């Protein structure tokens, strides 16, 4: 008696029942459900990664990181359902706390008060401080990756693209939230740019750099920030795109007050420091929390840190999907009876 949703088997029962379609996502359908054992509502992500190495990669990383992470502002994994043998496992079901919506969905329907904008921003940075303490880069931060409640509680999700920060060493529908140096040159700075981009989107209810492709993305960023001062040029390592930037016509910086005319001055000032073109000059997570825009919520004693760094020394993109399937089977074993 496996339960069906939109002609798709969701085999989560008898524990989880009353399935309701939420949305589609990478490789899988998400549903709200009732957990009959704990008498609580949950979200359940059905994942069918096993035909694609890349999908397997994102699933393992996600499971590993979310299980290691414990924070108020980061979504957790409550339970994971899968077949009792590896040959029988064609799907993995990830059970999480049910959140009412995500920031992307909210911004379609609703304009945000500068109050809610400020508080949302604080939670993003508070979650990110923890992430960066574990020396992990999220690398995918965007509004759909930010889960929300009507009680204004925010949680960061979707760690599938996350990895340990190293200086130095695959899509992704949107380049909109990706740092300029990613197009050019990894580092904690790239998550800050993303957060800068999300803040801008809460302000105007539109993406600040909605580029249609690689170079168009650059032209968007440059249309706002203007052409780099140098010192930005010449802090660039790859010399092929430095000269590309030199070969570009001049662009004027658009002052953050002309855009976002209705925005807090303190917000715009912080926006400026997240959105700096040079990664080295870009504001760090703990400095951002300490910015006057967040003074209302800033409390470093209540802003918890990771106990140690997170460890991925394991092989990243190279592993065969059969092996990854073995690893996913092992990682999810703690949720199985007899473990």
């Amino acid at each position: 008696g496996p339960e069906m949703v939109r002609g798709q088997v969701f085999d989560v029962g008898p524990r989880y029942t009353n399935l309701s379609y939420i949305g589609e996502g990478a490789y899988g359908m998400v549903c709200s459900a009732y957990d009959n054992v704990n008498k609580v509502r949950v979200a359940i992500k059905k994942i069918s990664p096993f035909e694609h190495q890349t999908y397997c990669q994102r699933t393992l990383r996600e499971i590993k990181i979310l299980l290691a992470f414990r924070h108020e502002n980061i979504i957790g994994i409550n339970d994971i359902i899968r077949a009792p043998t590896i040959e029988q496992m064609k799907d993995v079901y990830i059970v999480q706390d049910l959140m009412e919506t995500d920031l992307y969905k909210l911004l379609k329907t609703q304009h945000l008060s500068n109050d809610h904008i400020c508080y949302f921003l604080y939670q993003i940075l508070r979650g990110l401080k923890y992430i960066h303490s574990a020396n992990v880069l999220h690398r995918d931060l965007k509004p759909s990756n930010l889960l929300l409640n009507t009680t204004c509680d925010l949680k960061i999700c979707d760690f599938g693209l996350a990895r340990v920060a190293d200086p130095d060493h695959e899509y992704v529908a949107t380049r909109w939230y990706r740092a300029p140096e990613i197009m050019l040159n990894y580092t904690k700075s790239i998550d800050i740019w993303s957060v800068g981009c999300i803040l801008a989107e809460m302000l105007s209810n539109r993406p600040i750099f909605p580029g249609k492709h690689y170079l168009d993305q650059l032209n968007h960023i440059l249309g706002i920030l203007g052409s780099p001062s140098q010192e930005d040029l010449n802090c660039i390592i790859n010399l092929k795109a430095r000269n590309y930037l030199l070969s570009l016509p001049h662009k004027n910086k658009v002052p953050w007050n002309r855009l976002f005319p209705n925005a807090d001055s303190k917000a715009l000032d912080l926006l400026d420091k997240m959105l700096t073109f040079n990664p080295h000059k870009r504001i760090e997570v703990e400095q951002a929390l300490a910015h006057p825009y967040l003074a209302q919520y800033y409390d470093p004693s209540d802003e918890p840190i990771a106990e140690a760094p997170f460890k991925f020394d394991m092989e990243l993109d190279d592993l065969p999907k059969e092996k990854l399937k073995e690893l996913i089977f092992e990682e999810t074993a703690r949720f199985q009876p007899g473990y």
Partner: peptide
């Protein structure tokens, strides 16, 4: 959905104190 006051959030309640 529609957003409740910020004070509905528990973390925000720890801020008001």
């Amino acid at each position: 959905p529609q957003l409740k006051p910020i004070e509905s959030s528990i973390l925000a309640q720890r801020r008001v104190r």
